[PDB]
Amino acid sequence: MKFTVEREHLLKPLQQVSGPLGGRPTLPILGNLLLQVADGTLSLTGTDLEMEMVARVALVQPHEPGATTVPARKFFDICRGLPEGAEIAVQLEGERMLVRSGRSRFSLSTLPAADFPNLDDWQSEVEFTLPQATMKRLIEATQFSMAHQDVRYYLNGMLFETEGEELRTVATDGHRLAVCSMPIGQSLPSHSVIVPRKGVIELMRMLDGGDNPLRVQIGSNNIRAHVGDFIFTSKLVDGRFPDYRRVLPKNPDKHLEAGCDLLKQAFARAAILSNEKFRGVRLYVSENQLKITANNPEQEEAEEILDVTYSGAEMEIGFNVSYVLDVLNALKCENVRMMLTDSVSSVQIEDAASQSAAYVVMPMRL
Amino acid sequence: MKFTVEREHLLKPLQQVSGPLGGRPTLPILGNLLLQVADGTLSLTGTDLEMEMVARVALVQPHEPGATTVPARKFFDICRGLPEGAEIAVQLEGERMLVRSGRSRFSLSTLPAADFPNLDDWQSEVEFTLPQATMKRLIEATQFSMAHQDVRYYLNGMLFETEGEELRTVATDGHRLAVCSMPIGQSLPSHSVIVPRKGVIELMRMLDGGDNPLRVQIGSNNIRAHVGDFIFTSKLVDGRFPDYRRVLPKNPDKHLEAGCDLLKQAFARAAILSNEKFRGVRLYVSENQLKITANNPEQEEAEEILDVTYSGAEMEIGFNVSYVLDVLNALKCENVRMMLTDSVSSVQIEDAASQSAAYVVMPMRL
């Protein structure tokens, strides 16, 4: 195995394949990448056994086939460390990989390609392509509400749902919920999969937003995404994501419209004096006024009054201000619409101009 | 007490004085700021019993004199969170401090000014003033060599030495040393003072590199620095600091010049395959050539060859590469010079064009 590549052809591949590497890689070959030259294609693979990222770089210069596994972080840093535009020449000499460029020379140990983990062949069931852009908005819009490490392991992930010509992601904690659905331009059978949060972070990071279409294939226990030259395949978590259509409020008769930045600035200032643990802020809404107020254990008090569009009956509701700040930071839009019912129902928040995403935070009795 | 100020006049004071304050100290007043209106002035004071930072801001609007103590971090976040151009009105009411701005209203708990640690009055002994920019040079050129948590408590600090019309700083941890000396244009006594790692981090922090004189007053156990309307005083530490003149190589016969970024890019790359514990590298130096080699337990190796100006005997010398990477990064220059004696002795490194700063790193045996 010998190949010669330009540094810059190796760099974004190498960065991408090194994502899945992480979790205290006890089985040492997982800290390594699989390099294969076959045809005039170098493929690099990296896996954490639950997901896999493959990148292909075509080889225009002379090469010789074979396969081996190099230390990932060390090969990444040597290439990033060489100068811009450098020709890096790799060559496996027996059990060591030789990297030479200009006047530098490196020898890395190799672990055998034949020990590198293989994820099983599986078969596709649903397949569709969509602009990278749509998959980006869908994940960004909701990822913040996924659980992190929960006993309800199925919440540590994101629901991908197809229905009609809509792809829909939903993510929840068990506390707050985010939903985003976008039209995909192809009739699709109804499907639901939960992809593990590590996997949706990796998928998020392979999307550059540029012009290569993203193509996804879904099998019974795996998902695969092909963008240009990279291929990501992860498995799915086994099941029963709660029904998000039940947490949504049933007919909120009250609406409040307000600029996202003003509303965000006032809750971030009121949050400074709320209870550190529970973050409860109390809301009083009345004809064209919103008053936010916060108290904390040491009897300190914050109070914010603002002009809001709201015509309707007066009410109070308290909620955890971190959850609502999270959604106002995900809502990168001019105006926000908050839809309320009463002091004892959840509230829905959306952009006042796109019902595409909907976020629901529960009430707290403060 | 009652005063009214423009957020912008209040904010850099608030940040300079909060900076060092422990969020929740074990003696609570130490997490508050003393606020005093007297004469036409607000003085904000934060201390930790080791140092004290004082800011004054001129009060051009109505005010009423008095003193109180407010939670530092909260007050800073409330002022930072308010819109740009806000006029904040602070009024003491009972044992709450009321902060009003627009329609935002906050009420902060108060601890009494009487309880606030009065630091000690001391007599100045040597005084001099100098460009803020020379002081920031003197400290930046040297601070990365101070020890952090060394048992020889006097190394966790920086020595400021007055001799003639020069001010000098030296820092060392027993393994490498940095010296920087600059003309201050005033005849000074001959005096040395060790100021603590924390006091030099804070003095560097307030040196908003202007035109402005800095006046410094050294006492027997304190140092004070006045720049603008900020006054910083720190206690000093006692021990017998090392003499940099005994550390500096006697007469380095051999000299080598090389471009600093080439030198540095090459040591950062050999560093990748260096033993993780020792970070040891080997230089072989010969006529107009330098070869850097590193290797680790895993039996990986790195080799870099570069062209340098060297006329002199061949030599092999080993260093810890973190120690020379740290001086190449501090030295912000085009060509560097290494002055070597032999394999068993220190090497001096300095900018090839300046001599105000000099760094000596001891060799290793790998």
Question: Could you characterize the architecture of this molecule?
Answer:
The structure is a homodimer of 366-residue chains. Chain A is of the alpha+beta class and 366 residues long. The first copy, chain A, folds into three domains: 1-123, DNA Polymerase III, subunit A, domain 2 (DNA Polymerase III, Chain A, domain 2, Roll); 124-247, DNA Polymerase III, Chain A, domain 2 (Roll); 248-366, DNA Polymerase III, subunit A, domain 2 (DNA Polymerase III, Chain A, domain 2), CATH 3.10.150.10. Helix content of chain A is 18%, strand content 45%. Chain A has seven helices and 22 strands. Chain A has helices at 7-17, 72-81, 132-140, 197-206, 244-247, 260-271, 321-330; strands spanning 2-6, 32-38, 41-47, 51-58, 66-71, 87-93, 96-101, 104-109, 126-130, 157-172, 176-196, 214-218, 222-227, 230-235, 254-259, 280-286, 289-295, 301-307, 315-320, 335-340, 347-351, 354-361. In chain A, a hairpin with a 3-residue loop joins strand 10 and strand 11. In chain A, helix 1 (7-17) runs antiparallel to helix 2. The longest helix of chain A has 12 residues, at 260-271. The interface between A and B is medium-sized, with 29 and 29 residues. Chains A, B: One of its GO terms (molecular function) is DNA-directed DNA polymerase activity. Chains A, B: It is found in: Cytoplasm. Chains A, B: Pfam families: DNA_pol3_beta, DNA_pol3_beta_2, DNA_pol3_beta_3. Chains A, B: It comes from Escherichia coli (strain K12).
